[PDB]
Design a protein around this ligand. Structure first.
Ligand SMILES: [Cl-]
Ligand SMILES: [Cl-]
Ligand SMILES: [Cl-]
Ligand SMILES: [Cl-]
Lengths: 174, 174, 174, 174
């Protein structure tokens, strides 16, 4: 049993475990997106690298949450990780739209947990999210929005050409 | 149109644009103060440099606010920038008193925007101000207070001598 | 009062203050253009950086003019800074057309002030503009003209594609 | 006889020789000022160094004029150099007032020669003065004005104290 727990509600403990599940689900989704764009019949290396990087970022987020759970004297509880929502992710545009939807859902879960921490007068939780998650999420959604706009301007009437150019000239590749 | 905006009220968007206007007005005021102390008939280089540095700091503050406005999916809207309140700024003491008045007004606008963000449950906004503005402002007002006290102790009966010494021995110059 | 002023007409002093206002207005316009191209629904980083750089150049021009005003024993007088002419700046082409219009107006104000200095037999003023402004302005307008031509050749029937390519392959970005 | 002279009037040739005489007279005046402030009963090292530096600057100005006279195919003609106007130069304030008077007379001679060159359509002469003399003179007069203002603020009721402090804290010394 914990000898350290102080000002750490059962509600926050549970919500932190749910959020870990959401981050790991997001990581898994990004793993699937990354490997889809590595298929020989898709072959957009920059897109693959973008999503693989995000899989790592989301796993790291989950790990930070689990570290914090222990720091507060809460108990990590893991659940089944649902498989991603799709097996094939369509075009770069389809994929980036799906990623922004996912990110907005994570962001809402962050905001909801912040509000619960504020209601419970748990400033450590609130600070933790502010310091390590809220701005990271805002920055990422801005980046995805910027990408979506560029991808959309490139569709025009020459969709394949635009998809190639975006991958070659915006996204990081070898 | 924005595809990223989330948890970002129209009230906060508008107040952020007002605050940008206040920072730019403050920058302009400091530009005028800096060049006043560079006049051949005023000639207090350290005072000039102090206010020119502040003009840059305030412009940078405005730029950070504008970057954040975009990160959140709000829309920058610029207004007329009113000219500074004075064309001539009197003594170093007069100028530092005017600067502290200006700083307290900026600080109050920061606190008001923080309170609005708290009321709107917008923790990203609240964190942003905490992290980049509130302590910077407290530190600056402390510095100005410290200067005012030194300037005031130096007036005595030999005001010109004191004004020279403060500029030479407290403020940074070549 | 000044003990240094020599061969420096009231007409030139006033015109220098007007020109400072024009440079600062131009800086403000470029600030607005820069942040417009940073919007998530515009997202042309190279265009954003081009105009932000110009905002800094124009502010530096104003600062040089103010330094010179003091060097000659004139008195800086600041006016209200009008807001930019537009809140949204359209396409890269629209924006670059607006920038060239702005630059031509600044250039004309430089030429007018040079002519006034020549009429007043003020060679220091004339030299100052020659040395720090006239060629800088000619070079900048040439660069903008070169950009406009490239942007125009890229419109064709695939306007989005051309706008992306210009930003990626001509303008400086990360 | 010259085989190079082109577009170089006898009027400008003569005025250039007069200006050389004025620069050398100014150098001599500064030599006298420098050594006055090195007297054991005056003993203001920073003031001494300021004026000795100016003696060198004025001699260098004369040398540049003489080089240019030869470059244009004119003929240097030297006259008697009148001794400085005073044998003793009073206070630092008296001396700096005398220096500004001297500088304004040199500046007027520069402006007069520029106007003659403009009237004679001699752009090389005009450029030469612009490039090597007019701004140097404006900068120096600004510096002297700045010094005068500081010296004047330091007189107060404690003139000796102020004169010492100005020399110690504004002027360059060992
Ligand atoms: Cl189970
Ligand atoms: Cl308006
Ligand atoms: Cl007004
Ligand atoms: Cl003789």
């Amino acid at each position: 049993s914990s000898q350290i727990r102080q000002n750490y509600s059962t509600e926050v403990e549970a919500a932190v475990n749910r959020l870990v599940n959401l981050y790991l689900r997001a990581s898994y989704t990004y793993l699937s997106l990354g490997f889809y764009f590595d298929r020989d019949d898709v072959a957009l290396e920059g897109v693959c690298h973008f999503f693989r990087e995000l899989a790592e970022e989301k796993r790291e987020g989950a790990e930070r949450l689990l570290k914090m759970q222990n720091q507060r004297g809460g108990r990590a509880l893991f659940q089944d990780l649902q498989k991603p929502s799709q097996d094939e992710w369509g075009t770069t545009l389809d994929a980036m739209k799906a990623a922004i939807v996912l990110e907005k859902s994570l962001n809402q879960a962050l905001l909801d947990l912040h509000a619960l921490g504020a209601a419970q007068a748990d400033p450590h939780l609130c600070d933790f999210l502010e310091s390590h998650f809220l701005d990271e999420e805002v920055k990422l959604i801005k980046k995805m929005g910027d990408h979506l706009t560029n991808i959309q301007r490139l569709v025009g009437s020459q969709a394949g050409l635009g998809e190639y150019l975006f991958e070659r000239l915006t996204l990081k590749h070898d």
